[PDB]
């Protein structure tokens, strides 16, 4: 199978910047008719991927001139001469020259900004959930930048990892920050075995700590 290597996978940019994405083919993608079916797609969130460039350098209908494709053999490049607010999303390269037809892993074109520490909020289980015999402890690590932040749970001085469910949001369109939710899933009985519940935002010292006592 033809493997497509996209370089880089994450492209941090400022509006107005010149951007370049590379697509490296594991083998030649020249079809038996001499044509190279190398395509570039842009996927915005919620939307389906939309064609930008096909046959290496042909711009699709409605595609601006700031988007251009080039390359030969195993190295293909998508260039964005001026990054606009509407150009943000995930870029994919695709080859249709050999079966199976294949895509690259996707390049996230993301907005740069200054580092931001998260806002940590901890929530004891609700009385409504306790009545059902369940006790979920929820923590939010909101509006941080870049993705370099983690969660750490401590229950009465001991690190907790089992029963922890984490989810990260995409880059926020409001301020270019990321957010994450961490839920410690316990039964009412498990929750009653412990007193002090601690949620921390960690970095590669210094953590942002939130806690409550049962």
């Amino acid at each position: 199978d033809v493997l497509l290597t996209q370089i880089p996978l994450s492209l941090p940019v400022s509006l107005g910047d010149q951007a370049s994405i590379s697509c490296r083919s594991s083998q030649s993608i020249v079809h038996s008719n001499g044509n190279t079916y190398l395509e570039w797609y842009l996927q915005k969130p919620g939307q389906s991927p939309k064609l930008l460039i096909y046959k290496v350098s042909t711009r699709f209908s409605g595609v601006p001139d700031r988007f251009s494709g080039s390359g030969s053999g195993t190295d293909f490049t998508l260039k964005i001469s001026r990054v606009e607010a509407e150009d943000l999303g995930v870029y994919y390269c695709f080859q249709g020259s050999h079966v199976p037809l294949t895509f690259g892993a996707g390049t996230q074109l993301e907005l740069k900004r200054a580092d931001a520490a998260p806002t940590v909020s901890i929530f004891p289980p609700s009385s409504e959930q306790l009545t059902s015999g369940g006790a979920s402890v929820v923590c939010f690590l909101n509006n941080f930048y870049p993705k370099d932040i983690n969660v750490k749970w401590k229950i009465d001085g001991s690190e907790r990892q089992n029963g922890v469910l984490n989810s990260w949001t995409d880059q926020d369109s409001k301020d270019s920050t990321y957010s994450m939710s961490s839920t410690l899933t316990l039964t009412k009985d498990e929750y009653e075995r412990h007193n002090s519940y601690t949620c921390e935002a960690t970095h590669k010292t210094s953590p942002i700590v939130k806690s409550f006592n049962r």
């Binding site: 389906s48 695709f94 895509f103 996707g106 909020s121 609700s126 959930q129 909101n142 469910l165």
Partner: protein, 210 residues
């Protein structure tokens, strides 16, 4: 003018087969060159499943060839996808697309969930704390995806984070946060509005302190 519209069931039981329809408008499926079926896995990678040409000959992803069948109805201007012995690993957003000398056109895509799980509404719980104040909503144990979360019918959208759903074990769970000034809460009403269309539910949970 050109439109490719996917249709079919959103839920399929494991070992059963998924069937999807692509309804084409704007031009004929008889126009060159290929009429594709593509899938995008949860938060993921894209896979070209196969295509039927303008002349009716098929080309499949070798790994799917034995389970996959792409057919067409030239007079209805539709093409079809059949994927047989389905696994939980077939859960994806399925799109139909076209390719030719003009480039490519893509449909909007529909999520097809492959699970043994049955339709369950979520349990919605308020999250009140123990200059700004963060409140939340826990939307637990629903099936299938999706749910929609709004805060005060949308007037609070500015300081809202609705986190992606996680699957455990065969049910989905999500949370949503809202941050408002300390002046606004508990003095004024903050309500979390959750809708799960599949089970026809619409719940409104108010955030009450202590």
């Amino acid at each position: 003018d050109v439109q490719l519209q996917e249709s079919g069931p959103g839920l399929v039981k494991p070992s059963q087969s998924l069937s999807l329809t692509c309804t084409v408008t704007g031009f004929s499926i008889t126009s060159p060159y290929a009429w594709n079926w593509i899938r995008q896995f949860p938060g993921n990678t894209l896979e070209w499943m196969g295509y039927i040409s303008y002349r009716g000959s098929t080309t499949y992803h070798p790994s799917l060839k034995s389970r996959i069948s792409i057919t067409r109805d030239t007079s209805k201007n539709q093409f079809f996808l059949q994927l047989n012995s389905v696994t939980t690993e077939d859960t994806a957003t399925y799109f139909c697309s076209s390719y030719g000398n003009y480039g490519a056109y893509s449909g909007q895509g529909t999520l097809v969930t492959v699970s043994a799980a049955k339709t369950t509404p979520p349990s919605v719980y308020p999250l009140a704390p123990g200059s700004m104040v963060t409140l939340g909503c826990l939307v637990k144990g629903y099936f299938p995806e999706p749910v929609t979360v709004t805060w005060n019918s949308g007037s609070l959208s500015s300081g809202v984070h609705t986190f992606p759903a996680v699957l455990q074990s065969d049910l989905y769970t999500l949370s949503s946060s809202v941050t408002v000034p300390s002046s606004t809460w508990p003095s004024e009403t903050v309500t979390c509005n959750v809708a799960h269309p599949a089970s026809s539910t619409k719940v409104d949970k108010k955030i009450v302190p202590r």
